[PDB]
């Protein structure tokens, strides 16, 4: 149907805007601490601690499959990256600190992304 196409075009444009958002958030992680999944070879107990692992490569796979239907779903995954790290790692660690800085800096990006998603529809 023509309606299905129009919906598909909206999803494609959302995916475009989320790719730009993703790039901007990932630049706020210059140490690349959140770039890839925590390795279960190197952290064998991880899944005893963290039930829903997340990382920027995993988000990019979902994005490129157009697997984010709305900004809320994308923000959920970003919050998992931060929140998982802040639980697994202690306050005095470079990991925890990196997550705090990513959260604080990402907030600014996400605030305007929400406006753009609402604005463009």
Swiss-Prot record:
Bromo domain mapped to chain residues: 9-113
Tissue distribution: Highly expressed in testis.
Subcellular location: Nucleus; Chromosome
Glycyl lysine isopeptide (Lys-Gly) (interchain with G-Cter in SUMO2), cross-linked positions: 41
Function: Scaffold subunit of various histone acetyltransferase (HAT) complexes, such as the MOZ/MORF and HBO1 complexes, that acts as a regulator of hematopoiesis. Plays a key role in HBO1 complex by directing KAT7/HBO1 specificity towards histone H3 'Lys-14' acetylation (H3K14ac), thereby promoting erythroid differentiation.
Subunit structure: Component of some HBO1 complex composed of KAT7/HBO1, MEAF6, ING4 and BRD1/BRPF2. Component of the MOZ/MORF complex composed at least of ING5, KAT6A, KAT6B, MEAF6 and one of BRPF1, BRD1/BRPF2 and BRPF3. Interacts (via PHD-type zinc finger domain) with unmodified histone H3. Interacts (via PWWP domain) with dimethylated and trimethylated 'Lys-79' on histone H3.
The name this protein goes by in its record: Bromodomain-containing protein 1
Organism from which the protein derives: Homo sapiens
Organismal lineage: Eukaryota, Metazoa, Chordata, Craniata, Vertebrata
């Amino acid at each position: 149907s023509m309606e299905q196409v129009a919906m598909e075009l909206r999803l494609t444009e959302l995916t475009r805007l989320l790719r730009s958002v993703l790039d901007q958030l990932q630049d706020k992680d210059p140490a690349r601490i959140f770039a890839q999944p925590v390795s279960l070879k190197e952290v064998p107990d991880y899944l005893d601690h963290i039930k829903h692992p997340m990382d920027f490569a995993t988000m990019r796979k979902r994005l490129e499959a157009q697997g984010y239907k709305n900004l809320h779903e994308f923000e959920e995954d970003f919050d998992l990256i931060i929140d998982n790290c802040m639980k697994y790692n202690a306050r005095d660690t470079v990991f925890y600190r990196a997550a705090v800085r990513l959260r604080d800096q990402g907030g600014v990006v996400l605030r305007q992304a929400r406006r753009e998603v609402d604005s463009i529809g």
